Amino acid sequence: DGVGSSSGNWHCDSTWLGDRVITTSTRTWALPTYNNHLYKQISNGTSGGATNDNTYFGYSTPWGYFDFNRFHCHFSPRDWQRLINNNWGFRPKRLSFKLFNIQVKEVTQNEGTKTIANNLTSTIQVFTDSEYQLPYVLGSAHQGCLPPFPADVFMIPQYGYLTLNNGSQAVGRSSFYCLEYFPSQMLRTGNNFQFTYTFEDVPFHSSYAHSQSLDRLMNPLIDQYLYYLSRTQTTGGTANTQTLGFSQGGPNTMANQAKNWLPGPCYRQQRVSTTTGQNNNSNFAWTAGTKYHLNGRNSLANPGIAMATHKDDEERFFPSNGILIFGKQNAARDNADYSDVMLTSEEEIKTTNPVATEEYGIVADNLQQQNTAPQIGTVNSQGALPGMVWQNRDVYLQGPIWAKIPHTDGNFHPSPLMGGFGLKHPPPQILIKNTPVPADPPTTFNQSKLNSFITQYSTGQVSVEIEWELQKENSKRWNPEIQYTSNYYKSTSVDFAVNTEGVYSEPRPIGTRYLTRNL
Amino acid sequence: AHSQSLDRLMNPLIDQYLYYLSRTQTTGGTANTQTLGFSQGGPNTMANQAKNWLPGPCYRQQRVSTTTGQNNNSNFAWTAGTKYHLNGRNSLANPGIAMATHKDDEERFFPSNGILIFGKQNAARDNADYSDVMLTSEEEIKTTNPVATEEYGIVADNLQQQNTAPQIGTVNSQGALPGMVWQNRDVYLQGPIWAKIPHTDGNFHPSP
Amino acid sequence: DGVGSSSGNWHCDSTWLGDRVITTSTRTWALPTYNNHLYKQISNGTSGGATNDNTYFGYSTPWGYFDFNRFHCHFSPRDWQRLINNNWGFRPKRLSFKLFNIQVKEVTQNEGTKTIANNLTSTIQVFTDSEYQLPYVLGSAHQGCLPPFPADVFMIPQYGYLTLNNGSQAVGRSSFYCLEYFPSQMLRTGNNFQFTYTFEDVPFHSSYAHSQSLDRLMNPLIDQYLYYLSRTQTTGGTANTQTLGFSQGGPNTMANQAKNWLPGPCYRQQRVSTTTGQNNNSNFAWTAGTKYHLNGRNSLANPGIAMATHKDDEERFFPSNGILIFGKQNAARDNADYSDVMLTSEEEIKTTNPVATEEYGIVADNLQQQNTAPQIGTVNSQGALPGMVWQNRDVYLQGPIWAKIPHTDGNFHPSPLMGGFGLKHPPPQILIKNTPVPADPPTTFNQSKLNSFITQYSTGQVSVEIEWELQKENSKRWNPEIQYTSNYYKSTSVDFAVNTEGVYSEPRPIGTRYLTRNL
């Protein structure tokens, strides 16, 4: 372990083993000095134009953190294709992480002329929150993950967290965490860091789409032996009075047939069309937005529970805040145009889940009598009901992978709403920081803490290896299946490749549900 | 007690990579027509950010203040009481599912029949005065559970079009929803310890 | 052990083991060159406005020193809370010290443009005064200890000492010490230093407050069998002559009852109120100050023996110089305002110790006779008396921990008056210095000592681990106890956390006496 010896190699590859697939990827990173080596209290009150729904109290730290919670950090486009076109499911099993070839440099600034040189004796610090004692910031779809393209050099995100707040103030229970109060490993160039993790048991992700719908599971050729109320009034002319007539559900009355199950839960969202002319002329993104009310402040149920994006022949419709939306390469941060983003579709689950922009169903609303006509109510919000079955939101090549399940007394169907695997003990947070290097101190003692440091940043490589377990397809379907394919005809450039400028870009979101399976 | 709230689990310093519908209409003056604008949730738009979970179930109760002057002048203890209907007869859902007793800065508010109430030494059996009983508070769970005297949230109510403005509905009753997380009612030095779970074919979250 | 290899890791943590609690903390430090590599004789005479009470003769050295004699160098606020809310006592058992990741840098100064670079071959020197041969400077509440906040980088204090003096002159017995006359370890980047120490047996610190007072230990329901003189003169009208009447102490005459013990020693201090309007209008801080007379010069008995800060319902009163006073974050060095400091209170010992601003008691002053009325004297100074029992001053989260017991023929109740554990062989002094690096010498020999050195300072991390033994609480008290708690309602910031500026601050002093115990 010395100055002139590499402390690691570039491991980037994928190997398929029948029922396992192991992914490996390495990237080069850069870590600056954050907050001037200081922990700062950050807050956002109700003053100015700031709304209550956006208040917060927390702290920003001098630490950075590693994040690879995005599928394209591990699967190359072609690999993702191999995965989705041939398996009914998959899930993470274990992982290896490694930091190496660390170089800490110091930059000197004199009269506009800048010079960067090595500081051989400096150290960076690294540690894993293996006991989940720090606020788990991963799993909130933040930027800063390893880049999709292996050649791209990336910057490490700064770590910060939130605690209880009342307006812009803290409260009694507000907590303050100091990352220097954790044992951490110190490395100089020539030292390396690494650890292993094993994923807890989690269900395979459904990489398939149903080829049968919940309301069409019966035999199209046979009647039921069960009856249903089919007539409440006579028909023969004008002397129509009440009666009671019963019939047997059959091939032509499938909507009347007795069934064993119900569609999944529902929390209706407002519908919006990609053909702007069909939309109401008003700014309703927030006002008509579907939300949840938590201790005085509202949040968008984004994307909320899993529901089909639109029904048959309506591809132009989507829930105002009920789908995942990725930006195209270089799309603006604010008010990007429709042609600059990529909307995803959960249309594959129309089969078992309610359509997001429509009601769940109809219930009675009163007690009909001879002098009172029966009345009905439209259900737009429906919680779990005995007999329901549903599918979870799909995952995407550029989507999140896991999320920590909140430590609470209870929960229902722990599947992260943004998509992925819910884990009680997920991959630990990996925190990294550049150790402070004081510039020459004063010549006579002074109690004050030093605030004059040598300017410096670090850089090195990082490797992440993940073993995935596959669930092979076992279909007796006779006809070909739908598959993800590259375009056939000519084009200006290659999809999922680089520019003439060297910029890598992901042209579309790639789902997971291509193979089909019965109910 | 939780020291973080369900709606504040993200990093206060980083934007999300996900977008959300942020604009439905142009802004530049008076020629305002529909459009579609998308933005990325960030530190100042935490209420818009995409999240992974939902607050616990809700069965709204009527609110009452310990400052009698702020209450309606009528005897509504039973009439406005939150109840359940079982084979022709009604019972108070007392104290009912676990919900925060009141929100921030409202200590004077409590659910009509949604908290445990102990009597002080020698408090009368009937019509004991407020100063003779001791009300408990489940304020520690505002963090994950809905506030007992307020709605669960808002859902769409119709299908908006160019000739129809979007309408919304207030949810006052919300059953289990995939993604919910919640806390159970606290126990007290002078409170009950256990209870037998009814022998039935099924049940949900068997906590007394 | 090389240039490119870390020589230590960041160990900062606390682990509770039932009856032990182990604290670990690491900090980053900076050490400049002190005194230009010279030992200088320093002195302060009677000339100018200098008073005799402040004369001194000593030396300032080129060495620095490590100090972690302050509880907050080891316990985090929350940890201190765990300690004080659940134990009747605690004390230090052993410790580990470590110096590592040393970097010696040299700074070049040419035409205003400064540049700092590594000097790989330079060395720092370290050694422990394990035989207590140097004047023990620790234990005098000096600044320069490891910071409370783990992220704060600190400067190492310069070492200097004092010896006998007569005015500004030295005397025959005055001693001169040279630290280079001690074997010391020399380290280059890549080398580390470390040692172990074991605390001698010391009594647990009383982390409890008495729930009974010395004058109320009897049974409130039973009379004594003993009598006392209750009457010296008849009562029946006007013909009142002497007599002798005796009574039995009982529930209503508890102040007369015969008892077995006496309150602790007393050295009365002048009282001052935090309500300035109630104070005499004159500057009496020193003139009315409580002092001791030692060889011609006076010193404040600060804080002096342990006495209750004030009696019942008098929280606004305190001894002029009889309590520990900490400053709030950023309080001025001189004439800081009352609202800028934090006064401590030893009110928890009113129970066994005399109140600091009042007399000890009353004694006879003459021999009464039929022609002479009895006279009494007020005792304001009371030394040890057979039967006395007392409590020692409490310790604080930001207070000192130990102090070396003076090597003398005798002593009484060796407990350091500022608070803490008195040790005959305390943690040794750890001295550190940057080895002098000559700049190019002249080309032809010259007897004179070199006085031209390369400019340089060093920096690295330091770790201190201390094992504390706990004395669990064993109370049969039925009702809840008083506990240290965080505030409940909203606030601008969190107590014992950082600013929006990144400045850590300790909002109040935190004592140790919350749980209670009988007498």
Number of Cβ atoms within 10 Å of the Cβ of A291? 21
Q: Is B4 on the interface with A (CB under 8 A)?
A: yes
> Distance between CA C79 and CA C150 in Å, rounded?
14
Q: Which residue has the tokens 């019939």?
A: A247
Any binding-site annotation on A174? Answer: no
What are the E-state strand segments in C136-287? 154-155, 158-163, 185-187, 193-198, 205-206, 209-210, 227-233, 242-248, 266-267, 271-273
| Residue contact A110–C115, C-beta within 8 A | yes
> Residue A61, SS3?
strand
- Give the technique used to solve this structure: X-ray
Identify the residue whose tokens are 């070396």.
Answer: C404
- Alpha carbon dihedral A414, A415, A421, A426, in 10-degree steps, equals -30
Best of A142, A176, A413 to substitute, by most chain B Cβ atoms within 10 angstroms, is: A142
Q: Could you tell me the two tokens for A63?
A: 């630490």
Region of A438 (left: φ > 0; alpha: ψ -120 to 50; beta: rest) is beta
Tell me if residue A323 falls in helix, strand or coil. coil
Contact present, A40 and B12 (Cβ < 8 Å): no
Q: A30, A156 in Cβ contact below 8 A?
A: yes
**Which positions in chain A touch C10 (Cβ < 8 Å)?**
125, 127, 180, 182-186
Q: Do A3 and C8 touch (CB under 8 A)?
A: no
Q: Does any CB of chain B come closer than 8 Å to the CB of residue A328?
A: no
The candidate with the shortest Cα–Cα distance to C466, out of C6, C5, C8, C25, is C25
What is residue A487's three-state secondary structure?
coil
- Residue in A180, A445, A454 closest to C157 by CB: A445
- Tally the domains of chain A: 1
Token pair recorded at residue A9: 């190699």
Closest Cα in chain A to B158: A270
Q: How far apart are the first and last CA of chain C?
A: 57
Which of B2, B6, B18 is the best mutation test for A, with the most CBs of A within 10 A? B18
Task: Answer yes or no: do B11 and A164 touch at CB < 8 A.
Answer: no
- What distance in Å separates the CA atoms of residue C150 and residue C399, rounded to the nearest whole number? 17
The tokens 């004369």 sit on which residue? C55
**Alpha helices (H) in C361-517, listed in sequence order:** none
CA dihedral A147→A148→A150→A154, nearest 10 degrees, is: -10
Assign 3-state DSSP to chain A and report helix, strand, coil percentages, each to 5: 5, 35, 60
Question: How many contacts, defined by CB atoms under 8 Å, are there between A and B?
Answer: 336
Q: Which residues of A touch B43 (CB under 8 A)?
A: 44, 56
**CB–CB contacts below 8 A, A to C:** 200
CB-based contact A90:A22 (threshold 8 Å): no
How far apart are alpha carbons A43 and C493 in whole angstroms? 9
**Residue C31 touches chain A, beta carbons under 8 Å:** yes
* CB nearest C498 (choices: A3, A40, A186): A40
Taking the CA atoms of residue A379, residue A384, residue A385 and residue A391 in that order, the dihedral angle to the nearest 10 degrees is 100
A281/B177 CB distance under 8 A: no
Chain A residues lying within 8 Å of B38, measured CB to CB: 325, 327, 335-336, 338, 341
Separation CA C8–CA C13 (nearest Å)? 15
Q: For residue B104, give the nearest of A296, A300, A386 by CB distance.
A: A296
Helix (H) or strand (E) holding C83: helix C77-86
What does chain C come to in residues? 519
Cβ within 8 Å, pair A191-C6 = yes
Rounded CA gap, A94 and A152, in Å? 25
C497 touches chain A (CB under 8 A): yes
Contact A101, A193 (CB under 8 A): no
- C98: amino acid identity, one letter: K
Tokens 């409260």 locate to: A171
Residues A56 and C291: their CA atoms lie apart, in Å, by 53
Which residues of C, range 102-141, sit inside 8 Å of A by Cβ? 102-103, 105, 107, 113-118, 120
Q: Using a CB–CB cutoff of 8 Å, tell me whether A172 touches chain C.
A: yes
List the one residue out of A136, A143, A139 whose CA is nearest residue A157.
A143
Structural domain that includes position C437: 1-519
Closest by CA to A170, choosing from C366, C490, B194, C357, is C490
Amino acid at C79: D
Instruction: Name the residue among C81, C92, C118 with its Cα closest to residue C21.
Output: C92
Give the residue numbers of the binding site of C for AMP: 415, 422
Token pair of B139, please? 């304020």
Whole-angstrom distance, CA of residue C69 vs CA of residue C313? 34
Residue C188: C-alpha distances to residues C191, C196, C381 (Å): 6, 22, 57
**Amino acid making up residue A455:** T
Distance, in Å, from the CA atom of A429 to the CA atom of A403, rounded to the nearest integer, reads: 12
C-alpha distance from A278 to closest chain C C-alpha (Å): 48
Residue whose C-alpha is closest to residue B17's, from A342, A402, A33: A342
CATH number at residue C456: 2.170.30.10
Who among B22, B24, B144 is closest to A408 (CB)? Answer: B144
Q: How far is CA C322 from CA A318, B41, C417, in A?
A: 74, 57, 10
Say whether A299 and B168 touch across the interface (CB within 8 A). Answer: no
Distance of CA A278 to the CA centre of its chain: 30
For chain B, counts of helices (H) and of strands (E): 0, 13
Buried b (16+ CB within 10 A) or exposed e, B58-95: bbbbbbbeeeeeeeeeeeeeeeebbeeeeeeeeebbbb
Chains that touch B (3 or more CB pairs under 8 A): A
Contact: B51, A417; criterion CB under 8 Å: yes
Give, for C86, the enclosing helix (H) or strand (E): helix C77-86
Q: What is the resolution of this structure in A?
A: 2.7
The whole-angstrom separation of Cα A401 and Cα C478 is 53
Range 46-75 of A in CB contact (< 8 A) with B: 50-51, 53-54, 56, 58, 60, 70
Q: How far is A276 from chain B, CA to nearest CA, in Å?
A: 6
Residue A99, H or E segment: strand A87-110
A503 touches chain C (CB under 8 A): no
